[PDB]
Symmetry: D2
Subunit: 396 residues, 4 copies
């Protein structure tokens, strides 16, 4: 990756993460994305939105969003109609794959300024009626939940990803109690970061105009929901009796978007821009679809090798918490101590808007590195279907 | 471009293009895409499917297709579970942008063998019920047609693409008659190519489990030309004064197409025979309702990226979203129809939107061989205001 | 007794052809079929005008999406005065015959002199239901309910299809798959023979469908579909392997309507009308919902008692063939030979538009009594939920 | 003909749309009301009931024969004859007329009649799934609008027939607003003074996931009156010039009501104490969109059939489909409002359409009891152009 032209992150921003049918459920996925894009660009001293040439934006459940979600995000943010816009779907990894593709587009010389990230409005995912065109002459018929179908169910086995999380708990020996105490810890980290103002810089608050008083949404909705007694007492969510995965120790369904602004070396110098970070390398990997939970154990070493960095040099990791067991298993397989992982909490406590989470964890990682005075960060995120994506950054 | 690693096409393949609710409507988009991927890889002497490292696959109307359509295409084609898979949506340009991204992934050194292309099953696009979660307390509600919503409607104007086609006819001065004579010509070219066997090589026929088994070997739309009915039919989007009709627009269709890309190093390592070299590409965009003439920007950009002059191109594929789209881009660019869509275009062949960008590249490679040409350029506009274009050299 | 009450005369009856499910009459709504039968019945009374009709009782079971008061739509569509009293009646399969009883009673209490009664059903245009759109369903696949299954064919109590209760009936009274199959063939042959001789020509009012010339539906659509080896070889419909009830030996889903004109003795002479028949009595009965199949074995003796007529005096019976086993069980239970039952065929061969069939079999009964030179007739029809209705007529 | 006696009546509280009773189906509300009426008649066993007529308008998704489900849910014998009746808003009263007729012709001695409606649980319809719809957005029909509230020939909501009623007889936005306010405080006066407690059978809703048990004892609507908010709200069906609003119209509601009827012989045989005697009834109909005025025909017809003059009635219940309906019919019959809906009407109490015909009779007997009257008349208009009226004598 060294022999490849440099790619700088000059800013990042994210919406608050809203709960399912909660604080941001009135906004569409492109409205969330536009908000994150516009906020990220407003931070770059010396760069105009009209300088952005190309947009890659993740989005998984695109049904009823309309033509090209990424284009709607770009135009809604005030970018020029000349902007090249592509929507990316690598399930839960879409937001990070989008940033990788944006970096590659600078590296091959086809752009000098790129916005990448992702968005998801799980609240506004529709239901589907699949057989109306040819008809169904007789019988009860099904209305398909688009979240379940296109977001949460492995296509091969037709099983929800929570069931494959159980397979992870069984394979790697994590109990209900280990997953619950992880969840409590990541909720406590998210609450502590919230209360300390450590998300204030990365979050762009959302103003909802009154139809009625206006409402400003400022903080992530989920972290405050921790109730330790209830979390430890709730029934398993996917396997009765012997199940270890619960709604409290899994990621919720959520709404949100996140964006980063990328520039080439030449553009950085031309406009005298202050870089936040440098992309050092990345890696995608995949294995058996039902073992998607531990695909980050392949992608992270691959990204570190691409970046020319040893695992021990990393100051902070973001390992996306699709489930508590996913963070536990990948820490075990890679030998990464928890005190280097999700230092401000993870998706179990913060929320998991699936198309945006890969970019959300990168935004949060940059805030962790600044707050903890770190230099090298690595973000890794698994995705339904067996994949994972990982990226290494250097704070400047 | 030239100072970056070279990218070679070592094969390509496509399904027949089926009509809406027609010959392929029993297959899902991943089944079509897997078929095209498997068929393209079977053509490469000395390359195994297990050598494919990464897949980029276009798909626009992904509702109810399930998690990551590209990953389903890849696994359905027999690729390894280690394969990196990403689904791409740039509406009508998705299949060509997928190939571009695949080329870039080789150029940055992250893959040496990449499958790219696209798939669409418009037949199996569902309807949406959008307000079941929060409810709707009182009043008639709508079931949204997913084709209209996510494929064919400009988001800003909330107008179907046929009305943007009328803007194109008004802006660049093409009458109903000019559009109709263009459409008849492209149907004639597609039928001539069909009968002469010129699609035999690129098409991988589909066997349908049987009643006995059905084999689908031909594109469904070309035979439907009736020049008398075409000249007499009422306009489809503007009553009375309209110029765009269903016969002179692309249909709704099902199909998939795939290409196999390899690096120079890997070509040498496996002693592979390349079909073509990617010379360059370009994306461009402008006002969304003017997407119809975005190729007049993307094509010059691709040629410049390729270091190739427009006059040196031996054949162009200009995707026929509507007849007026080809007419307007030929006018703006100064490209004679004698070099355009030499085996017919999407008005006659069909337009499965997530696949069409790779579909036209597969057809172009056949045109360059059949017409003894060397340099080809494919350009395709897309809803939202964009276009993508690519330049290849037949080897 | 009945003699202390005014007499009620049938001066007319008519019926549409019975169409197959999504078949010949599928483009017509229930009120259009109903209007057709009412207008045809009234056109047959010399000395009576449509404006003389004062009140209408009309059966209809699956009224969803038919609009306000189906009976009122049938009346206004038939050309009846807007002063006409209109009530829609739902007693499931017996609705069409209960409407006739309620019409007779309205004369007998002296509130009307000219009454049209009958029933209609377009099972082809029964919609599907979305039951929880108002409050919402936050997450999960949902159901589109088939209105035929829900409001027509499923016993509300056990949530069982009536076919499975026909299977329960076969197990109760000992009727084999062969015995039900050979009855179905016999009633199919009777319906075809009656069709062949033109014995349905008087009672059926052909339907003209616009579109330049006009298509005309003259025959019932189901009788021609008999295929005796297909019928004996088909797999059972409700219990794989061991079931005796099949689709060929059950009634189909159908569209049709039927109406009769009732007058008081005063108006019969005041207008000098020629009566076709006299209503001598009726009987409603009900038992266990899953045993509705043998409810006519209670309603039929009750209607004979009400009329003061003996079962041996009856020249012809119409026992509605919801399933072939219904006719077999009721014949066995009542000691009625088949040689006096459904002489022109029954619903297994003719069709079962559920809201109309109670009136349809009375229309056919009057035709059987004319053709076979009989005087006393009895019509009995079971309905889902446990009930049955029966009526005794004397041909004049 | 044999006399028909009312031996008891009962009604559920009237729940608001998607409100306090929304968790109950129409047969559950109906079962509740039948059971409560039957528990009031000592000397009469629930197994003595031979026949049920029950009104219900929007029967979609209620299941087979709603009245049969009401009857069995109340504990009546499986031997009971059960028939569901739909004369739209008049179904509850027409059911009672049919029940009285069944006694008068000597086919039954104990009949339960009334009506039920759960407008909260009325579904939406998808009408073209069987034959299908190949391309285009489609409609989900609101079953309340289609089968309850829209006139068949005009395809206009009842609120627009109500505006017709205003212009036809000259009642302003103010006049209807003052009536609505008057019937609201007439209804609120009855709650606090307890004049509904006899007729209402409260409903128990037990929560047992740890949740607290809930009892519904009051009608939900009367407490909602805000006269400041009411006078200043915008019109509901005609902007600017309209006179009909949500506050001055009836709401959408859930509820049920039932009466027990006995023959002359059975009253003496079992030594039952009668609440009232049914004196007569009348049905009438005119132009569909002029249904608001049909009570002006049914009421005189019921009075004439009972052999009683209009001046002798101690209390009228004229169903307030809209405040303008009560105002109009009082104008044409010449009835003073001091003898109309003395405990309030449907604008303030609620209007579950299949039940109101029986609900207003139940309230009528409570008015005659509390006002020490002898002759009461209830009339009710229904969509389609009809109306029904009944005359009773308290005993
Ligand atoms: Cl994957
Ligand atoms: Cl675009
Ligand atoms: Cl019943
Ligand atoms: Cl009416
Ligand atoms: Cs800026
Ligand atoms: Cs901020
Ligand atoms: Cs959680
Ligand atoms: Cs370190
Ligand atoms: Cs091969
Ligand atoms: Cs080779
Ligand atoms: Cs081939
Ligand atoms: Cs065409
Ligand atoms: Cs050339
Ligand atoms: Cs006549
Ligand atoms: Cs006839
Ligand atoms: Cs049959
Ligand atoms: Cs009692
Ligand atoms: Cs009470
Ligand atoms: Cs109100």
């Amino acid at each position: 990756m060294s022999s490849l032209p440099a790619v700088y992150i000059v800013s990042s921003a994210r919406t608050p993460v809203g709960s399912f049918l909660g604080s941001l459920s009135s906004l569409t996925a492109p409205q969330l994305g536009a908000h994150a894009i516009k906020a990220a660009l407003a931070k770059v001293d010396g760069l105009k939105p009209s300088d952005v040439q190309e947009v890659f934006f993740g989005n998984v459940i695109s049904a009823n969003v309309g033509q090209n979600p990424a284009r709607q995000c770009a135009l809604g943010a005030g970018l020029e109609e000349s902007t090249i816009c592509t929507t990316v779907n690598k399930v839960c990894a879409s937001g990070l794959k989008a940033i990788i593709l944006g970096a590659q587009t600078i590296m091959t010389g086809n752009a000098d300024v790129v916005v990448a990230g992702g968005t998801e409005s799980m609240s506004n995912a529709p239901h589907y009626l699949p057989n109306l065109r040819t008809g169904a002459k007789y019988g009860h018929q099904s209305l398909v939940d688009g979240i379940m179908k296109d977001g949460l169910t492995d296509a091969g086995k037709q099983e929800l990803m929570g069931l494959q999380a159980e397979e992870c708990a069984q394979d790697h020996g994590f109990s209900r109690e280990q997953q619950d105490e992880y969840a409590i810890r990541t909720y406590e980290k998210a609450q502590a970061a919230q209360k300390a103002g450590l998300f204030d810089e990365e979050i762009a608050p959302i103003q909802l105009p009154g139809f009625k008083p206006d409402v400003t949404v400022t903080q992530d909705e989920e972290p405050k929901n921790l109730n330790p007694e209830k979390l430890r007492a709730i029934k398993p969510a996917f396997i009765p009796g012997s199940g270890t995965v619960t709604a409290p120790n899994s990621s919720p369904l959520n709404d949100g978007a996140a964006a980063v602004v990328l520039v080439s070396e030449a553009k950085l110098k031309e406009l005298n821009l202050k870089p936040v970070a440098k992309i050092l390398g990345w890696g995608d990997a995949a294995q058996q679809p039902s073992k998607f939970t531990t695909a980050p154990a392949l992608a992270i070493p691959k990204a570190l090798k691409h970046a020319g960095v040893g695992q021990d040099a990393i100051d902070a990791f973001e390992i996306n918490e699709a489930f508590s067991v996913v963070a536990l298993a990948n820490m075990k397989l890679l030998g990464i101590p928890e005190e280097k992982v999700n230092l401000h909490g993870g998706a179990v406590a913060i929320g998991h808007p699936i198309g945006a989470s890969g970019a959300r964890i990168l935004t949060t990682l940059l805030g962790v590195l600044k707050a903890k005075k770190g230099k090298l960060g690595c973000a890794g995120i698994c995705n339904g279907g067996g994949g994972a994506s990982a990226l290494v950054v250097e704070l400047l």
